[PDB]
Design an enzyme around this catalytic site. Structure first.
Site, PDB file in Angstrom:
ATOM      1  N   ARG A  23      33.376  32.819  37.481  1.00 38.45           N
ATOM      2  CA  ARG A  23      33.647  34.017  36.692  1.00 38.45           C
ATOM      3  C   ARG A  23      34.763  34.793  37.340  1.00 38.45           C
ATOM      4  NH1 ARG A  23      32.180  39.340  36.103  1.00 38.45           N
ATOM      5  NH2 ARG A  23      32.201  40.065  33.943  1.00 38.45           N
ATOM      6  N   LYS A  48      35.826  41.263  44.210  1.00 38.14           N
ATOM      7  CA  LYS A  48      34.661  42.034  44.608  1.00 38.14           C
ATOM      8  C   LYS A  48      34.849  42.672  45.968  1.00 38.14           C
ATOM      9  CE  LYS A  48      31.276  40.405  41.362  1.00 38.14           C
ATOM     10  NZ  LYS A  48      30.020  39.662  41.105  1.00 38.14           N
TER      11      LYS A  48
HETATM   12  N1  LIG Z   1      26.809  36.309  35.771  1.00 36.63           N
HETATM   13  C1  LIG Z   1      27.539  37.265  36.315  1.00 36.63           C
HETATM   14  N2  LIG Z   1      27.940  38.270  35.551  1.00 36.63           N
HETATM   15  C2  LIG Z   1      28.601  39.287  36.127  1.00 36.63           C
HETATM   16  N3  LIG Z   1      28.865  40.328  35.326  1.00 36.63           N
HETATM   17  C3  LIG Z   1      29.562  41.479  35.856  1.00 36.63           C
HETATM   18  C4  LIG Z   1      29.847  41.382  37.324  1.00 36.63           C
HETATM   19  C5  LIG Z   1      30.586  42.606  37.807  1.00 36.63           C
HETATM   20  N4  LIG Z   1      29.768  43.115  38.860  1.00 36.63           N
HETATM   21  C6  LIG Z   1      30.218  43.709  39.992  1.00 36.63           C
HETATM   22  C7  LIG Z   1      29.373  43.717  41.094  1.00 36.63           C
HETATM   23  C8  LIG Z   1      29.862  44.011  42.344  1.00 36.63           C
HETATM   24  C9  LIG Z   1      31.194  44.326  42.528  1.00 36.63           C
HETATM   25  C10 LIG Z   1      31.674  44.666  43.901  1.00 36.63           C
HETATM   26  O1  LIG Z   1      32.832  45.157  43.967  1.00 36.63           O
HETATM   27  O2  LIG Z   1      31.021  44.344  44.835  1.00 36.63           O
HETATM   28  C11 LIG Z   1      32.033  44.362  41.416  1.00 36.63           C
HETATM   29  C12 LIG Z   1      31.548  44.067  40.158  1.00 36.63           C
HETATM   30  N5  LIG Z   1      29.548  40.392  38.075  1.00 36.63           N
HETATM   31  C13 LIG Z   1      28.960  39.276  37.521  1.00 36.63           C
HETATM   32  C14 LIG Z   1      28.580  38.082  38.359  1.00 36.63           C
HETATM   33  O3  LIG Z   1      28.915  37.867  39.483  1.00 36.63           O
HETATM   34  N6  LIG Z   1      27.850  37.153  37.649  1.00 36.63           N
END
Ligand SMILES: Nc1nc2ncc(CNc3ccc(C(=O)O)cc3)nc2c(=O)[nH]1
Ligand SMILES: Nc1nc2ncc(CNc3ccc(C(=O)O)cc3)nc2c(=O)[nH]1
Lengths: 255, 262
Positions: free
Chosen positions: A234, A199
């Site tokens: 995750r 992230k």
């Molecule tokens: N339960 C859960 N599901 C997710 N699903 C997609 C994601 C993908 N989401 C992003 C949000 C922020 C970032 C970033 O680069 O900050 C990258 C992907 N994250 C999660 C998570 O942390 N928890």
């Protein structure tokens, strides 16, 4: 210890478990996602999280259902569907998904009722970056409200997981605060899932601009999340996270 | 702890990274177009770019003349091309003296100054010294035995005129120790930190890491090594001897950010 019944496949959280990320964003797209989920299962993933969104329900189904159907037949691992849409939740569970990973914490109209009927575990994630007077207190209050809303809808508390939603409407400082104060979220009586995999906040802390350059920092964040109470992680980097947790488990086991 | 490495200051206000620089033909892909010295210098420079706080240069049974032939030119080139403190990984006092004359600022001794002449050599050099434990033998209590040995070497160094502020101690992970002994020493590392001297831990790609994770090849042990080193830092280690510098730096940076939260 929390014992999650993922539509017949038991996930036991007696120790931190690893949820392998399977992104499905055509037959060649399905084929690549299935092969990847199989690689993550070989790397020691305890669960696979299948996502087809970032789109219409029927498009999201065209991507996710063939991957769920193929992975349920080719692996013995519990399968999670990463969706906020109730029609996808019902169809994915009919296809073999054993858990719902909901970024919207069942806030989409009809999600509560949809999941109440399914009897699969559900991840209640926080997503509102806005200004927070106290991000830890606000994430805690939101998660309390969603646990209670799920319970009032007939979803047994034992099917619930919670997640602070690292990187969702959160600055690097908010993410670090949530990670450092993660034990405060573990007091809600429900397993905590942490997702810091590659992230942006990991990249900001380490100066690593591209996702794949953030593996070392992500493996360290996930180990710290497990030390601070997270029972599910995750991750994209399954074998590496498995190795980190195995070393820590060996040290932790010493009386 | 503020270590004066022959003019180059290593400040242990936070866990620091000691980059491994092995000067042996076997340590490099022998294509036959590079010298061993050239490959070792380029590697030390790469580790400095990755954020190493100190480089540990080792040439080794290696005959003393061959050890000198390996380590000295590498020390001379790295002292000119980097501002980092340089450690010499040797148990031989002739190598200790010559390396310090070449620019080394610290002595990393696997024998904890037990070689005849090492106490004298270090007392005269006024550089920091690592006192490592090496006897796998049966241990009734590996933690108590490693602690006792380290107390005896701290005492012996001090009695020889080596200022306590120049000392570092190290449990010697993997030296005459089973996987169970190494895990015990890592878990009980805070007990060693009570001796009032900085603790160095080196578990980099070691066989015990390989046994804990089921990773047969050294290069497959990176994640497990980075985790072991983070745990060693959480348990009091102030210096970490690693091959995987950028990865260990990133792990410690994430941990420092979390630890900084009041
Ligand atoms: N339960 C859960 N599901 C997710 N699903 C997609 C994601 C993908 N989401 C992003 C949000 C922020 C970032 C970033 O680069 O900050 C990258 C992907 N994250 C999660 C998570 O942390 N928890
Ligand atoms: N201070 C210090 N210096 C060292 N020098 C060489 C080495 C290399 N030692 C090994 C011992 C065992 C193994 C193994 O695979 O078990 C590999 C290398 N380690 C250290 C160390 O831990 N501390």
């Amino acid at each position: 210890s929390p014992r999650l019944d993922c539509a017949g496949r038991i996930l036991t959280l007696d120790r931190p478990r690893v949820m392998g990320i399977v992104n499905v964003t055509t037959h060649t797209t399905v084929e690549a996602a299935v092969a990847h989920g199989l690689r993550l299962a070989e790397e020691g993933a305890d669960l696979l999280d299948i996502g087809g969104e970032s789109v219409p329900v029927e498009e999201e189904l065209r991507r996710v259902i063939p991957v769920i159907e193929r992975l349920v037949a080719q692996t013995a691992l519990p399968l999670s569907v990463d969706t906020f849409k109730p029609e996808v939740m019902r169809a994915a569970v009919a296809a073999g998904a054993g858990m719902i990973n909901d970024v919207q914490a069942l806030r989409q109209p009809g999600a509560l009722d949809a999941v109440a009927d399914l009897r699969v575990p559900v991840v209640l994630m926080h997503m509102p970056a806005p200004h927070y007077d106290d991000v830890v207190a606000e994430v805690h209050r939101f998660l309390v409200e969603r646990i209670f809303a799920a319970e009032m809808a007939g979803i047994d508390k034992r099917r619930l997981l919670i997640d602070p939603g690292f990187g969702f409407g959160k600055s690097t400082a908010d993410n670090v605060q949530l990670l450092a104060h993660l034990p405060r979220l573990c007091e809600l009586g429900v397993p905590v899932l942490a997702g810091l995999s590659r992230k942006r906040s990991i990249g900001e802390l380490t100066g690593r601009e591209l996702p794949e350059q953030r593996v070392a920092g992500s493996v360290a964040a996930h180990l710290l999340a497990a030390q601070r109470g997270a029972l599910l992680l995750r991750v994209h980097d399954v074998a590496a996270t498995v190795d980190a947790l195995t070393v820590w488990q060996a040290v932790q086991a010493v009386p």
